Nucleic acid binder design. Sequence first.
DNA 1: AACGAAAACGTTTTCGT
DNA 2: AACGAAAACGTTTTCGT
Lengths: 339, 339
Amino acid sequence: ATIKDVAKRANVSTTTVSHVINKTRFVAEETRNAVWAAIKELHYSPSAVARSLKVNHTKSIGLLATSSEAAYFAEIIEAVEKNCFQKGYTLILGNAWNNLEKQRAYLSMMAQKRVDGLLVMCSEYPEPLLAMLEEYRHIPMVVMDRGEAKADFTDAVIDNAFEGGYMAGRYLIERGHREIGVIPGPLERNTGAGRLAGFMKAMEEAMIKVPESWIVQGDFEPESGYRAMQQILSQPHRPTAVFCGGDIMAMGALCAADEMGLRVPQDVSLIGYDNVRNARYFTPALTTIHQPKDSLGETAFNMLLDRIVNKREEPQSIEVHPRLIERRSVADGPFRDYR
Amino acid sequence: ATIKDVAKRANVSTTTVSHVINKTRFVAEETRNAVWAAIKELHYSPSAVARSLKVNHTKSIGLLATSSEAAYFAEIIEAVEKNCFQKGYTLILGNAWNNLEKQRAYLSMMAQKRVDGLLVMCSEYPEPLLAMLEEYRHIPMVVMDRGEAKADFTDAVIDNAFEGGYMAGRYLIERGHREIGVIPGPLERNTGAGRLAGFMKAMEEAMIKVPESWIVQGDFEPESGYRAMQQILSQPHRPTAVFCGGDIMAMGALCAADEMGLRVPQDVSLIGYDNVRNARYFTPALTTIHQPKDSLGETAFNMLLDRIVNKREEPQSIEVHPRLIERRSVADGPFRDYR
DNA sequence: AACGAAAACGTTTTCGT
DNA sequence: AACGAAAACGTTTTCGT
Ligand code: HPA
Ligand code: HPA
C-alpha cells in the first residue's frame, strides 16, 4: 500500500524503492527485481498525490467546457483528451453550461486539485467571467473559443469565424443566390456573431440586402434550426438559399424544410458550418464550412503544455483555418449564368 | 500559497486556519474574518492534494470510457459528469478506444491519481480486460455497459438490450412487416449482440426467417449504417423493413436509401435504437427504441458513490428500461390488415 | 473558551555512508 | 559503488493549553 511496505518487503530502503520505481538513479538488478517483486505481491500503486505533493505538479489538465454532448464540442474534447493521453496528462472535464457560478465552482475545484494548466471553452465571456478568469491568472491557461484577445493573461487560438461566414456567403453567391437568409448561433459567442458578420460582409460586397425577416437567431441546437428554418421558409416571400451557422442547427433546418414540403437543395439550398463528423450523412449530404476541430484541440493542448513545460510567459495566439466543403445541399441559384 | 503564509498573515495557527477553512470547529468571528481576509489578499487556494494526502480520498471519479464523440456515449458522459458535479466529485474521462493497453494505462493513471471509484464503459470485455479489471478489484467501480454479470467484484447496471431488440422486431411485425432486415452493432458488445437477439427472438416467434443477405454488421458508426443499408437495399430481393441497432448508424442507413432512390418510410421502413438526442431531427424523424441514458449515467454514479460513502461491499446490479418511440420512419407493411 | 504543538499522510531528494 | 537517513511537500487532527 505504501512505498514503506514495499521497501520493507524488499529489504531495502524507501529511497531505494523510489529510485527503481522512477528509474532515477542506478540500482542493482537484484535490488530492482526485489523491488518489483515486492511491488507485485504487495499489488502496489504509487500514489500520485504523494508524489505530487513533493514534485509540485499534478500532470493533469482542467477543461473548463460549456457542454460536451454538442457534437461540435464533443469533437474538440475528444481531441483534447487525446493529446492529454499522448503527453501523460490526465483530463478533468468541466461543463459549466455557461453558468457563472458553476464556472466559479469548477475553476476552484480545479485550482485546488492543482491542475498543471487550464483549457478554456466557455463560449461566452461576459465581464464577470473575464474577471473570474484573471484571478486564476496564475495557473497557465489557453482560451480556445474566442474572437480576438480580451485577454493578456492568456493563450489563445483563433478560428477565423468571420472568414468562414464570408466563405459561406460567397459560395452562396458564386452559386447564383441573392435572396439569402441566415440563422446564426448566439451572438455572444464567436462562432455566433463571428460567422454572421463574415457572411454579412459577403452580402454587402454583393450588394445583397438581407431582410430581417430572413435572419433568425439559433442557439446551436436542432430545435433552433427547425424553428428558425420554419420561420424563414414561411415568409410570404422566402429566400432561395440559407446559411445556417452550425451543422446541428442545420440538421434541424433540413427537418423543417422537408416537413414543410420544400426540397433541399431543389427548393432551398443550405450551407451549414462546423462540418460535424456526421454531416456527410445528413440528408442530403450537408455542404458546410469546416472547422479544424482536432487541430483546434491539439493546438490548444500543445499551446498550454508549452507555458507549462517551457514555462513560457508571453501570451500567444495561434490561428486555425476554416475551409468550405462542398456536399449536396446547395444548388445553383437564379444568377448563376449571369456572371 | 500555503496554509502557513495564511495563518501567519492572520496571526493565528495553521490549525486555526484549517478550522475556519473547513468549518470544523468553533472559531472566533474576528479570527474567522482575519483568516478569510488573509486568504483573500494572499489569494489562497487550499491544495486538495495536501488534504487528500491526509484525508484519504480524492473526491474524484475515473471514467474508463471507450470514446466520447459518439452521441450515445457523449450523452452518457455528460450525464455522469453532471452527477459528479452535483455531488462534489471531479471527473476524469478516459477514452481507451477499446485498446487494452490504453486501458491498462488509464486504469493505472487512475489508481495512482487515487480515484475514489471507477465508472466502466469499455464496450467490450474480453478476458484480458476482465483480468485487468480485477486487479483493481480494490477500488470501487461499476461497469455500466454489459450483458449480465461476468463480474462478482463489481457493480452493474443492465440495459435490457434484448428486450429492446425484441421491442423493435415486434413493432415492425405489428406494422405489417415480414421481410425484415437488420444491421447490428459489434457482436462483442451488449448493445450489439444483445439488441440483435432481442430482435431475433421476435422473428422466431413470428416465424419470420431472416435471410443472411439481410443481416449486415454495423459498428455503431454512420459509414457502417450506410454501407450496411446499401448492402441490404441492393439485394435483388430486399426487405420491406429494417432494424438498425444504433441511431447514428441508422442515420447512415437513411443516407444510402435516399441516395439509392428509395423513400423512407415509403419504400423502406427503419427502426433504430438509442434515441439519440437529435434523432427527432433525422429525416424523416427516426422511429427508435430509447435508452434511458441520463438514468443510465446517474444510476451508475449513484450506484458507485454508495460503495464509496456507505462503504457497501455486496455487488449490486440495477436494471434500466428501453422503450419504443414512434416517430416518422416506419409505415405499415403488407400484413397490416391480415391480423 | 478558544486556540496551538506537533504527528501524521506517502512520497522525493539531498546529503551522506 | 551502491545504497540509506531524514527533511521535506501542504495539509488534518489529536492531544493539549
Ligand atoms: O457554441 C457552440 N455550440 C455547438 N456547436 C458549435 N459550433 C460552433 N460554436 C458552437
Ligand atoms: O457502443 C456503442 N457506441 C455508440 N453508440 C452505441 N449505442 C449503443 N451501443 C453503442
